[PDB]
Every structure is written in structure tokens, then in C-alpha cells.
Amino acid sequence: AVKKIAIFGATGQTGLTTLAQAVQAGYEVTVLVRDSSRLPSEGPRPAHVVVGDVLQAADVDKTVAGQDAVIVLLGTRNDLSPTTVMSEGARNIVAAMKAHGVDKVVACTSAFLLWDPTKVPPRLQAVTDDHIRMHKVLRESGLKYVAVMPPHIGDQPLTGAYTVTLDGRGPSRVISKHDLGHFMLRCLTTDEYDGHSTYPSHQYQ
Ligand code: NA
Ligand code: NA
């Protein structure tokens, strides 16, 4: 089964709770971060910290080596400018997975990849363009890839009670960051979402 995982993006909002939940679940977790002090110094903490940059192939290789599976939660530090930082990070992650024979990757993009393109808000088009590039990298890799395409990510407490919609939009437009992290981890325990797009969502009121 899956026992050793790498998490990319662990210092972001969904990343931090995914990381805590992964450690609590008993995974042996490796993270790649720019600064180890961005991780909590108390509570559940990962087994291995690599300090480096997801845009550097060798730093990513050190992080993927020896893993059973990879979680990808890269973002743009809330910058909406045209960018390739997510897709280029994913390119490095896939390259290292291929070199080491790691097959399983669970990666977050956004529900806008399931929208009619004519309805994506223009202000979010540049970030969505790079999510599309990232999804292409992962789909073309031939790895076992679960495409997680969440709607708006909220701060509601963990429920574990959300809906998972396959290959289409789901009936709520929000998912808590805690439920999203919970779902990321669920995708490590099953192959049934491999090659599919998944949309987690929930009604919190
Ligand atoms: Na970081
Ligand atoms: Na759903």
C-alpha cells in the first residue's frame, strides 16, 4: 500500500491541513519548502523536510525519491498574473516520478477546468491557463493521475461528509480546505479515481 508520500505546496492553505492530516493518518511524509520555518513547529510534523524550489529539477528529485505517491498542491501565492510556475513545477514532479518509477499522483487544479470556457471569469483566466497546462502535463505523463478540480476553497471545519462528483461539476460551489485535504488523502487509498476528474463539494449550512 501507500506509506511514504511527498507533498508539494505544503505551506499553502490547503497544503498545511493536508500535511497535518497526512501525518495524523500515519503517512511518512516528505515536503519541499522554500524555508523550513514556514511549517508549524508544534503538533503533527512531517518525517522529512527538503528545503529548495519546485522550479529546480534536482530539488524536486530529492523529494520524490523513495516515495510511494505524490500530492501536488501548488499555487501562485495569490498572484493572478500570467504564470507558468504551476505547470513548470508539475513538469519537474512528473520527470522525477518517471526517473524513480513512482506511479501515483494526486494533483489539485480547479473546477474552472470543468466549466464552459466562455464562462471562466476573465480575471482568473491567466491562472486557469496555467492550471490547464499543468493538467496537460499530468494527463500526458501516463502516470496514475487523479485530477482534483475543486470549486471555491473555504475555511469551514472538517466534515468528512462532502460529495465527490466524477468527470463533471458537482452540486455545491464550495469545499472546505480541510475537506479538500481529506479527499486528497482518500485518493491515496484507492485507484478508483485514477484517470478521472474529481470535484469535491459540500453544503456547509
Ligand atoms: Na514554501
Ligand atoms: Na461534488
Author numbering: 2 to 206
What does the paper say about this structure?
However, it was later discovered that BLVRB is identical to flavin reductase (FR) that is a promiscuous enzyme responsible for reduction of flavin substrates, which includes flavin adenine dinucleotide (FAD) and flavin mononucleotide (FMN). Structurally, BLVRB comprises a typical SDR fold with a central β-sheet flanked α-helices on each side. Like other SDR family members, the coenzyme binding site is within the conserved SDR fold itself, while substrate specificity is dictated by the variable C-terminal lobe.
In both apo-RT and apo-cryo structures, R35 and R39 are both found in specific conformations, as indicated by clear electron density. Most surprising is that in the apo-cryo structure, the R78-loop (residues 77–80), which exhibits high R1 relaxation rates indicative of disorder in solution, is well modelled in electron density where the R78 sidechain interacts with its crystallographic mate (not shown). Although this suggests that the R78-loop is “closed” and would therefore block binding and release of the coenzyme, the R78 side chain does not form the hydrogen bond to T12 CO that forms the clamp. To determine if this defined conformation of the R78-loop is an artifact of cooling to cryogenic temperatures, the complementary room-temperature (20 °C) structure was compared. Such comparisons highlight the potential misinterpretation of structures determined by cryogenic crystallography without complementary ambient temperature experiments. Elsewhere, both apo structures are generally similar, but there are significant regions throughout the enzyme which differ when comparing the apo-structures and the previously determined holo-structure (0.8 Å all-atom RMSD).
